[PDB]
Design a protein around this ligand. Sequence first.
Ligand SMILES: [Ca+2]
Lengths: 43, 43, 43, 43
Amino acid sequence: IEKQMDRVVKEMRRQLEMIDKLTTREIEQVELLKRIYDKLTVQ
Amino acid sequence: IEKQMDRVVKEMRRQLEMIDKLTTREIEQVELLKRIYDKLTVQ
Amino acid sequence: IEKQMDRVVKEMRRQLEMIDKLTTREIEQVELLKRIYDKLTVQ
Amino acid sequence: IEKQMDRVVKEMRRQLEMIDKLTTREIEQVELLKRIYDKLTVQ
Ligand SMILES: [Ca+2]
Protein backbone atom coordinates (compact mmCIF):
# COMPACT_ATOMS: atom_id res chain seq x y z
CA ILE A 1 0.00 0.00 0.00
CA GLU A 2 3.05 2.27 -0.06
CA LYS A 3 2.18 3.19 -3.65
CA GLN A 4 -1.30 4.43 -2.70
CA MET A 5 0.19 6.07 0.40
CA ASP A 6 2.41 8.10 -1.91
CA ARG A 7 -0.57 9.11 -4.07
CA VAL A 8 -2.27 10.42 -0.92
CA VAL A 9 0.78 12.48 0.00
CA LYS A 10 1.00 13.95 -3.51
CA GLU A 11 -2.70 14.87 -3.50
CA MET A 12 -2.32 16.62 -0.12
CA ARG A 13 0.59 18.68 -1.47
CA ARG A 14 -1.59 19.63 -4.42
CA GLN A 15 -4.42 20.47 -2.04
CA LEU A 16 -2.18 22.77 0.01
CA GLU A 17 -1.17 24.84 -3.02
CA MET A 18 -4.89 25.30 -3.71
CA ILE A 19 -5.70 26.30 -0.14
CA ASP A 20 -2.87 28.86 -0.25
CA LYS A 21 -4.39 30.34 -3.40
CA LEU A 22 -7.84 30.57 -1.78
CA THR A 23 -6.29 32.09 1.34
CA THR A 24 -4.45 34.88 -0.50
CA ARG A 25 -7.34 35.64 -2.88
CA GLU A 26 -9.71 35.89 0.08
CA ILE A 27 -7.47 38.52 1.65
CA GLU A 28 -7.48 40.60 -1.54
CA GLN A 29 -11.25 40.30 -1.73
CA VAL A 30 -12.02 41.44 1.78
CA GLU A 31 -9.54 44.29 1.51
CA LEU A 32 -11.28 45.44 -1.69
CA LEU A 33 -14.69 45.09 -0.05
CA LYS A 34 -13.65 47.34 2.81
CA ARG A 35 -12.40 49.96 0.36
CA ILE A 36 -15.63 49.80 -1.64
CA TYR A 37 -17.64 50.16 1.55
CA ASP A 38 -15.57 53.23 2.45
CA LYS A 39 -16.21 54.78 -0.97
CA LEU A 40 -19.95 54.55 -0.22
CA THR A 41 -19.86 55.85 3.37
CA VAL A 42 -19.26 59.17 5.18
CA GLN A 43 -15.56 59.88 5.72
CA ILE B 1 3.97 2.95 6.64
CA GLU B 2 2.55 3.86 10.05
CA LYS B 3 4.91 6.83 9.91
CA GLN B 4 3.37 7.96 6.61
CA MET B 5 -0.21 7.36 7.79
CA ASP B 6 0.47 9.37 10.90
CA ARG B 7 1.93 12.18 8.76
CA VAL B 8 -1.13 12.20 6.49
CA VAL B 9 -3.34 12.56 9.57
CA LYS B 10 -1.33 15.50 10.92
CA GLU B 11 -1.21 17.32 7.57
CA MET B 12 -4.97 16.79 7.02
CA ARG B 13 -5.86 18.35 10.37
CA ARG B 14 -3.42 21.16 9.62
CA GLN B 15 -5.08 21.89 6.26
CA LEU B 16 -8.55 21.53 7.79
CA GLU B 17 -7.59 24.26 10.25
CA MET B 18 -6.74 26.53 7.30
CA ILE B 19 -10.04 25.69 5.54
CA ASP B 20 -11.80 26.37 8.82
CA LYS B 21 -10.37 29.83 9.15
CA LEU B 22 -11.29 30.30 5.49
CA THR B 23 -14.98 29.55 6.06
CA THR B 24 -15.10 32.10 8.88
CA ARG B 25 -13.63 34.82 6.67
CA GLU B 26 -16.15 34.07 3.91
CA ILE B 27 -18.90 34.83 6.42
CA GLU B 28 -17.36 38.28 6.94
CA GLN B 29 -17.40 38.83 3.15
CA VAL B 30 -21.06 37.90 2.78
CA GLU B 31 -21.95 40.25 5.64
CA LEU B 32 -19.88 43.03 4.19
CA LEU B 33 -21.48 42.53 0.75
CA LYS B 34 -24.97 42.83 2.24
CA ARG B 35 -23.98 46.15 3.90
CA ILE B 36 -22.59 47.46 0.60
CA TYR B 37 -25.76 46.48 -1.23
CA ASP B 38 -27.92 48.31 1.33
CA LYS B 39 -25.84 51.49 0.91
CA LEU B 40 -26.98 51.29 -2.74
CA THR B 41 -30.62 50.53 -2.04
CA VAL B 42 -33.16 53.28 -1.59
CA GLN B 43 -34.01 53.15 2.12
CA ILE C 1 -2.94 0.99 10.64
CA GLU C 2 -6.71 0.55 10.33
CA LYS C 3 -7.14 2.95 13.25
CA GLN C 4 -5.23 5.75 11.49
CA MET C 5 -7.00 4.85 8.25
CA ASP C 6 -10.29 5.54 10.01
CA ARG C 7 -9.01 8.90 11.29
CA VAL C 8 -8.19 9.85 7.69
CA VAL C 9 -11.68 8.93 6.54
CA LYS C 10 -13.26 10.97 9.35
CA GLU C 11 -11.11 14.00 8.54
CA MET C 12 -12.10 13.81 4.85
CA ARG C 13 -15.78 13.76 5.80
CA ARG C 14 -15.17 16.82 7.94
CA GLN C 15 -13.29 18.44 5.08
CA LEU C 16 -16.21 17.84 2.68
CA GLU C 17 -18.70 19.61 4.94
CA MET C 18 -16.32 22.58 4.94
CA ILE C 19 -15.91 22.58 1.17
CA ASP C 20 -19.70 22.50 0.78
CA LYS C 21 -19.95 25.56 3.02
CA LEU C 22 -17.32 27.43 0.98
CA THR C 23 -19.06 26.40 -2.24
CA THR C 24 -22.49 27.71 -1.22
CA ARG C 25 -21.15 30.91 0.37
CA GLU C 26 -19.15 31.64 -2.79
CA ILE C 27 -22.34 31.42 -4.85
CA GLU C 28 -24.10 33.91 -2.57
CA GLN C 29 -21.13 36.24 -2.79
CA VAL C 30 -20.84 36.34 -6.55
CA GLU C 31 -24.59 36.74 -6.93
CA LEU C 32 -24.46 39.73 -4.56
CA LEU C 33 -21.47 41.17 -6.41
CA LYS C 34 -23.34 41.05 -9.71
CA ARG C 35 -26.32 42.84 -8.14
CA ILE C 36 -24.06 45.51 -6.64
CA TYR C 37 -22.38 46.00 -10.00
CA ASP C 38 -25.81 46.42 -11.60
CA LYS C 39 -26.80 49.05 -9.02
CA LEU C 40 -23.76 51.08 -10.13
CA THR C 41 -24.21 50.69 -13.90
CA VAL C 42 -26.59 51.94 -16.63
CA GLN C 43 -29.74 49.82 -16.89
CA ILE D 1 -6.96 -1.84 3.97
CA GLU D 2 -6.05 -1.44 0.30
CA LYS D 3 -9.77 -0.93 -0.26
CA GLN D 4 -9.79 1.95 2.24
CA MET D 5 -6.58 3.49 0.87
CA ASP D 6 -7.99 3.37 -2.62
CA ARG D 7 -11.20 5.03 -1.37
CA VAL D 8 -9.23 7.81 0.33
CA VAL D 9 -7.41 8.46 -2.95
CA LYS D 10 -10.65 8.69 -4.94
CA GLU D 11 -12.37 10.97 -2.41
CA MET D 12 -9.29 13.26 -2.21
CA ARG D 13 -9.21 13.76 -5.98
CA ARG D 14 -12.96 14.33 -5.90
CA GLN D 15 -12.64 17.04 -3.24
CA LEU D 16 -9.62 18.55 -4.99
CA GLU D 17 -11.80 18.94 -8.08
CA MET D 18 -14.30 20.92 -5.98
CA ILE D 19 -11.53 23.09 -4.49
CA ASP D 20 -10.23 23.60 -8.01
CA LYS D 21 -13.52 24.90 -9.30
CA LEU D 22 -13.62 27.06 -6.16
CA THR D 23 -10.30 28.77 -6.93
CA THR D 24 -11.50 29.63 -10.42
CA ARG D 25 -14.67 31.25 -9.09
CA GLU D 26 -12.66 33.32 -6.59
CA ILE D 27 -10.78 34.79 -9.55
CA GLU D 28 -14.12 35.95 -11.00
CA GLN D 29 -14.94 37.62 -7.65
CA VAL D 30 -11.66 39.50 -7.47
CA GLU D 31 -12.15 40.72 -11.04
CA LEU D 32 -15.71 41.74 -10.35
CA LEU D 33 -14.64 43.61 -7.19
CA LYS D 34 -12.04 45.59 -9.14
CA ARG D 35 -14.72 46.63 -11.67
CA ILE D 36 -17.05 47.72 -8.86
CA TYR D 37 -14.29 49.75 -7.23
CA ASP D 38 -13.53 51.54 -10.52
CA LYS D 39 -17.22 52.47 -10.92
CA LEU D 40 -16.72 54.31 -7.61
CA THR D 41 -13.41 55.94 -8.48
CA VAL D 42 -13.27 59.31 -10.16
CA GLN D 43 -12.06 58.53 -13.69
CA1 LIG E 1 -14.93 35.11 -1.62
